[PDB]
Amino acid sequence: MDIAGTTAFITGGASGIGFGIAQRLLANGARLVLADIRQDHLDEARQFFEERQQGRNVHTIRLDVSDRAQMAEAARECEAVMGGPDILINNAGIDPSGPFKDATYQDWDYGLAINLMGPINGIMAFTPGMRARGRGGHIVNTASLAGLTPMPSFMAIYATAKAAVITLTETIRDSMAEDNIGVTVLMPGPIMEPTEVGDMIVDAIVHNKLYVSTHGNWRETCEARFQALLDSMP
Amino acid sequence: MDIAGTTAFITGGASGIGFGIAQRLLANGARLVLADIRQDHLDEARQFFEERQQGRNVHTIRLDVSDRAQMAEAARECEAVMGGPDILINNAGIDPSGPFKDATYQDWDYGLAINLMGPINGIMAFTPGMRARGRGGHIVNTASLAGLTPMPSFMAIYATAKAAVITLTETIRDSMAEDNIGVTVLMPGPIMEPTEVGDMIVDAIVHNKLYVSTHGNWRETCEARFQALLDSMP
């Protein structure tokens, strides 16, 4: 899809990959709504754009992506203030990792709430409008290569959630396509510069690419896992 | 591990795959605790074994695997009544499929609660004892080939949950290994006789196999997905 003239709503938008994506979407003609849990991060992020004389095209919303009522409110605020959005970037995450025997129900609940239910809540809250407005759109979900390559037990919660996000994104593709909404799952490793990731995401939105991986260092470990899965099949 | 003289706790144990696993574990010398949400199913399953003079080796518990308090109760009752368990089969599932546009938060919460949090709750409630008793054990989680091969959007919730269970099982392996507890993820297709699946699980427990797939029909479709993932990697 064409990025020019669109509005992008970006969770975890005040730092890291989310902020790199923000920069490159704005550079390609999008207006921005940055959502994040930290007030100070959001103000710093908009100040960056302020210094580049683009403050009027960036709005910020303090948001907990696990709060479904807040997510619905944010979708209405986005539409009112900046329009749309046409582009939804579900990028917020957290890392609940630690010795697996020390893991608690609270770790599981929080880990899944942000990393898995965040994107689900975004899809639930934003797609009714994205479908109804009828001008297409795009959804990017940030997963991780930790959702694909074999991971150790101290990363069980994170890996489990991010694997789910990969399959979620794959599986909703046909449903979203009915209303000309493309989907992409972003699978980072160690974050390469955020604006480089941003440009990969620009390409994925423009050309409707399902998969974006930032690194290839786990090609062989992934291949080995994939082969073991295949070998299990009679 | 040797199955003879062990106790197996099996969720969704009163029908389908769970009951086939129950049958073959008992045939290999395990005592059984069958857990299921349906009391009438449990009664029928109990009767089946009673008529084959195996009644005193089977115990039934009505259980909602998404209820953590009930799961804690079940672990206490299992240990008291039948001992152990040495073998934990997290097999309960449900399918909230339907047009993805019409999916509700309730569909997602139910789908994830049973299919993903069920096994997590089983692990959390049962593995402390399995570790403490110090005689090792085995955990089988029932996922699905739907968690691996590309699925249509109307199956998004099920596919998402089952993909997560595959990764859950992979990642916890090294933690469970510390206490000589092996793990297996079972990935079924269309259910082939349940007892045939049961024998695959006997083999997995005896030989500590990480993966069991019941069908080879999705080899090529999985290969294509895996290749697309690999191709995304720089």
Numbering used by the authors:
A (entry chain A), B (entry chain B): 1 to 191, 229 to 271
Anything the authors wrote about it?
A cellular pathway has been characterized that performs β-aryl ether (β-ether)3 bond cleavage using three sequential Lig enzymes. The first step in the Lig pathway is a stereospecific oxidation of the benzylic alcohol in the GGE substrate to produce β-(2-methoxyphenoxy)-γ-hydroxypropiovanillone (MPHPV), which is catalyzed by nicotinamide adenine dinucleotide (NAD+)-dependent Cα-dehydrogenases LigD, LigL, LigN, and LigO. The final step consists of a GSH-dependent lyase, LigG, that catalyzes the elimination of the GSH thioether linkage in (βR)-GS-HPV to produce glutathione disulfide (GSSG) and γ-hydroxypropiovanillone (HPV). Our structural and biochemical studies of the enzymes in the bacterial β-aryl ether cleavage pathway reveal the features important for substrate and cofactor binding and catalysis by these Lig enzymes.
The LigD and LigO enzymes catalyze the oxidation of the (αR)-substrates (αR,βR)-GGE and (αR,βS)-GGE, whereas LigL and LigN are specific for the α(S)-configured substrates (αS,βR)-GGE and (αS,βS)-GGE. We have solved the crystal structures of LigD, LigO, and LigL, which by amino acid sequence alignment belong to the short chain dehydrogenase/reductase (SDR) superfamily of enzymes. LigD, LigO, and LigL are classified as classical SDR members that have a core structure of ∼300 residues and share the 11TGXXXGX(G/A)18 sequence motif at the cofactor binding site and the catalytic tetrad N115-S144-Y158-K162 (LigL numbering). The superposition of the LigD, LigO, and LigL structures using Cα atoms shows a root mean square deviation for LigD-LigO of 0.88 Å, for LigD-LigL of 0.70 Å, and for LigO-LigL of 0.93 Å, indicating that the enzymes display similar overall structural features. In these alignments, the most sequence-divergent region is in the predicted substrate binding loop. This proposed substrate binding region is disordered in all of the crystal structures solved in the apo-form (LigD, LigO, and LigL) and in the structures of the LigD·NADH and LigO·NADH complexes. However, in the structures of the binary complex of LigL·NADH and the ternary complex structure of LigL·NADH·(αS,βR)-GGE, this region is well ordered, suggesting that this is a flexible loop that undergoes a major conformational change upon cosubstrate binding to the enzyme.
